[PDB]
């Protein structure tokens, strides 16, 4: 973040979508929720129909309980690409945000079926399974989540 402040010009910082994504993810890692949202909204302003990694935005907006923004993003992301696992994981995150979670588990498993090498869908499944009060399924899902990404 200090390098962004010093070694990155403002015009490049506030225009480059990759800078917006990286800065939002970084401020997520420092658990700075307010900072990340007003730059991810700018990123959506640059292009609404971009996927890359909305897992981060879905995770943020689940905490912020913004149902309408999540609904709009899920609708747009599915309408753009149906086969991308990120769209399905965002939809499942919204579903877990609402209330019901069995269909969220099924949607997450479908997203993992689209791309078996997506570790974040696996870890999101494991995190959700805690809400189901089930551990053995959760523990197996966690281990298979670690298998995909060694340093998670």
């Amino acid at each position: 973040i200090r390098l962004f402040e010093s070694q990155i010009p403002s015009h490049i910082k506030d225009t480059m979508p990759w800078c917006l994504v990286q800065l939002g993810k970084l401020h997520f890692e420092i658990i700075n929720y307010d900072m990340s949202l007003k730059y991810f909204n700018r990123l959506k302003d640059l292009q609404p129909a971009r996927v890359k990694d909305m897992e981060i935005f879905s995770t943020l907006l689940w905490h912020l309980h913004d149902k309408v923004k999540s609904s709009n993003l899920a609708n747009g992301l599915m309408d753009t690409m149906p086969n991308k696992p990120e769209t399905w994981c965002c939809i499942g995150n919204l579903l877990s945000l609402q209330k019901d979670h069995d269909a969220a588990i099924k949607a997450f498993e479908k997203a993992t079926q689209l791309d078996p090498n997506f570790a974040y869908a696996y870890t999101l499944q494991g995190h959700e399974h805690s809400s189901n009060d089930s551990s053995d399924s959760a523990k197996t899902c966690y281990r298979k989540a670690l298998a995909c990404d060694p340093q998670h």
Binding site: W62, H63, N93, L124, H127
Partner: peptide, 27 residues
């Protein structure tokens, strides 16, 4: 058990049945 139905019926349906029992984070 359902030994007999109304008006001298033969078989029986069951529309619904349920059983009831009692008992910060990073996503």
């Amino acid at each position: 058990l359902f030994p007999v139905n109304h008006e001298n019926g033969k078989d029986t349906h069951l529309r619904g049945i349920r059983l009831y029992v009692p008992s910060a984070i990073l996503r």
